[model samples]
Target: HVSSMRPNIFLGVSEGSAQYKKWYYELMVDHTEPFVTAEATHLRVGWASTEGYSPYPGGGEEWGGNGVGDDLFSYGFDGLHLWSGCIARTVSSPNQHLLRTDDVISCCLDLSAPSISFRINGQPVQGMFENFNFDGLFFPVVSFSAGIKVRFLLGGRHGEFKFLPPPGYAACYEAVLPKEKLKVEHSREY
Candidate 1:
């Protein structure tokens, strides 16, 4: 199956994510199913002084923690992009800061053994990573685009990344309209 598929991988989401934190994206088989693995490092946690969100409630520079950021902004790709309900409606945190999927939903292809884990706001939470074959569950088209739009307290980086995954959802079938599924060209260590 792994060799037959195009590295079928779904990692993490849009902005307002910290760049310094060890953000990790996961792949699962059920809402309650734990992550099979961290597919990517969505956003690390950026310039701690960026007057923005932080992985911890008070971890930001404005709050008194180190001002060094650890989000994707530090990596310079706008941030990991995707559209998945598994990310928005499901992702959560214990610290209350891991509010966005961008914090812990990145993917990678260097290794594979299903060695997986999931975290939120720097702590491990529950009800994530479920597997559902699209064509098996719902008659999926040969090809389709996903959408997930996001928002926050402000605009620009000020506004959290615009996603196809509903503020708290993901999936899709949009052309001009973005859906929850992302336009991904992925690979894995199968």
Candidate 2:
């Protein structure tokens, strides 16, 4: 997802099959206004046991699969899994495609303020995040994973992210968003 200036998108990868694996990508560019932007990836399993450790930047382990060895999850700084938003369990990620998952590598892209046009997956995914602006602080989760030797990367290191935040509330275009039920892609529902 690329805007006029900043990058705001998220991604995630998982261990699928032995070779030629399947993957998923999430692109979020709220055009409604300019509120917040974020990205994330999760694994099917987290360090359910004592948690595994590897000598590496942004390396650690955490509860996964609901348990260690049974469940494990983690991320890092600058690494592909860098989170630009709050790391709370109930945290809200504007990008739905990049939401939590099990047994996978997730990359998060977050931008609080943005300044242009919005596009997703090369096309345009309208509805910005700044419209519903809120007062909050983002806690960059560097070395947040507590599972195993899961590598990491910044949000779009191998990919890309574009950012463009709005100046103030109700300052964006006043186009009535299309309803989710509408076939022509309403402005925004979620």
Candidate 3:
């Protein structure tokens, strides 16, 4: 679900597809608000083992299939599926790190570097993708098999974050620009 108060903040879940479950939170193009102007976004995610079978639909142990729950977070920008890291039980990611349910992830776009880096729990993954299409908006999205939940941390005065962002990286527009300059521009558009 998208945030009404925070456009950059969102929450989502899987319908429990055996193949793959997915959710998307698109970043709006407008920078009229500080919440929407963040260059890097942070996410706090939690994975659940089991809630109940949706086929059960109500909540019980009667009608069931693979009642066990499993989830993973594969975050990336639109048109890109780096699959940087994930935590899938009984399975291993050969090229990616194993991500935990309570991990903090950052989808960073550095204009100065002209690259995109996916960070896990405050640390950037080994590889960096260069030649970003800065003209397009990047999204913090997830694909799971069972159950997963995500929360966005668009920092600033109004927001709270779990992990510290990378050096020279911030989650708010205020930190990216001078308050005096932001106020003048913010007032006119908003």
TM-score of each: 0.20, 0.19, 0.40
All candidates' lDDT scores? 0.23, 0.22, 0.34
- lDDT minimum window of 10 residues, candidate 3: 181-190
lDDT of 1 by residue, 1-190 (tens): 1100111122222355523111222221111212337332122211111232244655533221211112211111112212232133333445543223344322211111211123332344443323422111110111111121221111122223222221222221111123433332222223
Candidate 2, lDDT over the whole model: 0.22
lDDT of 2 at 178: 38
TM-score of 3: 0.40
> Mind giving the per-residue lDDT tens digits that candidate 3 earns over 1-190?
1111123222223245322112211122211212335343322222111222133546443211211112111223212224233322232222343343455555564545555555555544555545523332222333222223434555555445656656666454333223333221000111
Clashes of 3: 1
Predictions: Cα RMSD each:
19.2, 19.7, 17.5
Error (Å) of candidate 3 at residue 107 is 2.2
**lDDT tens digits, residue span 93-159, model 2:** 2343331222122222222232112222233333322332222211112122222122222223343
In angstroms, how far off is 119's CA in candidate 1?
1.3
Clashes of 2: 61
Using TM-score as the measure, what is the rank order of every candidate, best first? 3, 1, 2
List candidate 1 stretches off by more than 4 Å: 1-87, 98-117, 134-190
Q: Which regions of candidate 2 are displaced past 4 Å? A: 1-118, 139-190
lDDT of candidate 1 at residue 78, scale 0 to 100: 14
